[PDB]
């Protein structure tokens, strides 16, 4: 039983960062080589484990996520960092044990007229608790008077469209990010490569 890693990476239409989708992986023989042999990565930061030994350790559960974020915002996907992505969209824990693989996919997204299908949240009452997803379109009460649904003055919609297009700089083109999170605990080991 091989491991569905090609369906996580080579998958069209990655979900937007404000609604990232978990892809919990279990009952597999995961070979962390199809990951390494897939395109020149813009950032291959691995926290808590050595990426050269990922083919040996067995964990209990590994999660995969799928983003589309700006080029300058990939630096916010790291433990103990703050911003507009790592505060209201995706908060990594302070004891993270995983990898922060990120591409530079610009020829798939960023339509010439403008790709408005990717939305990120910039408005929230408080910072996101680590590993929490907030799918909500309630009008943000940025003022004092109540909003009551209407998007009037001091009443803004939290989600904002990235508006990618194939003319922006290297730091602003679409960037697909896939983060793998490993948890090891008292449950029997389930996922590792052929080498044990």
């Amino acid at each position, epitope marked *: 039983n091989l491991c569905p890693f090609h369906e996580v990476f080579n998958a069209t239409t990655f979900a937007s960062v404000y609604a990232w989708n978990r892809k919990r992986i279990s009952n597999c023989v995961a070979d962390y080589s199809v990951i390494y042999n897939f395109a020149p990565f813009f950032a291959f930061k691995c926290y808590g484990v050595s990426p050269t030994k990922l083919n040996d350790l067995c964990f209990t559960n590994v999660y995969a996520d799928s983003f589309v974020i700006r080029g300058n915002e990939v630096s916010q996907i790291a433990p103990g960092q703050t911003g507009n992505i790592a505060d209201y969209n995706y908060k990594l824990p302070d004891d993270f044990t995983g990898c922060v693989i990120a591409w530079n996919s610009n020829k798939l997204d960023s339509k010439p007229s403008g790709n408005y299908n990717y939305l990120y949240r910039l408005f929230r009452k408080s910072k996101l608790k680590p590993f929490e997803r907030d799918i909500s379109t309630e009008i943000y009460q940025a003022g004092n008077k109540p909003c009551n649904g209407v998007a009037g003055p001091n009443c803004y919609s939290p989600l904002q469209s990235y*508006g990618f297009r194939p*003319t922006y*700089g290297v730091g*602003h083109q679409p960037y697909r990010v896939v983060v793998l999170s490993f948890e090891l605990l008292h449950a029997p080991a389930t996922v590792c490569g052929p080498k044990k």
Partner: antibody
Amino acid sequence: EVQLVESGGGLVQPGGSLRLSCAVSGFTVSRNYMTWARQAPGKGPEWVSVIYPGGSTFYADSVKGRFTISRDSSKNILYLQMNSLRVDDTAVYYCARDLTIRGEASWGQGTLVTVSS
Amino acid sequence: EIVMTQSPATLAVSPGERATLSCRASESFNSNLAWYQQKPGQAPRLLIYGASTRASDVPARFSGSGSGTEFTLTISSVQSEDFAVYYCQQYGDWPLWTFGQGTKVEI
């Protein structure tokens, strides 16, 4: 009618401390991006510090480790604490509920900060 | 970060005539440029946001255009009051931005 009033400007010897207050009327200071912009008397305004509606604070490279930006939602006031002031930092300081992406930017009247010996 | 330069620095146009400003960016950013107007002794006021969209209470004469690294502000006809300093701000890394230097419009 969004209004912002700065206070605390004046003359301070180099290396001193200065607390700039910002009375904001029209909305809440603890639920909006607040920036402390600085304009030299001979060029365009430059950003110094910014506070998110969550609590995260960012500072400019030239001012990192010296200025502390704080908020008081009880009285709806933005504070900027000024430490290790230099002759360079003589300018006019403005508050700003930036929100430039949404097309709503309000800048305060601003106050003059002069550092000389 | 991105450095922004606007020329000419001493634009002079008689009232009621077209004025063509210009801004230039060191690199390419995500089409996030704003045009600001600042009269002497006053705070900067939003005039154009998104490099092509006017803000509220902005007269129809002002119009931004251009994309990439070349952005242009066009005033249909200045009338005795638009004589102020105009800046091109780039909020490509919002809420972090850098301003221009000045395009003071003299009568």
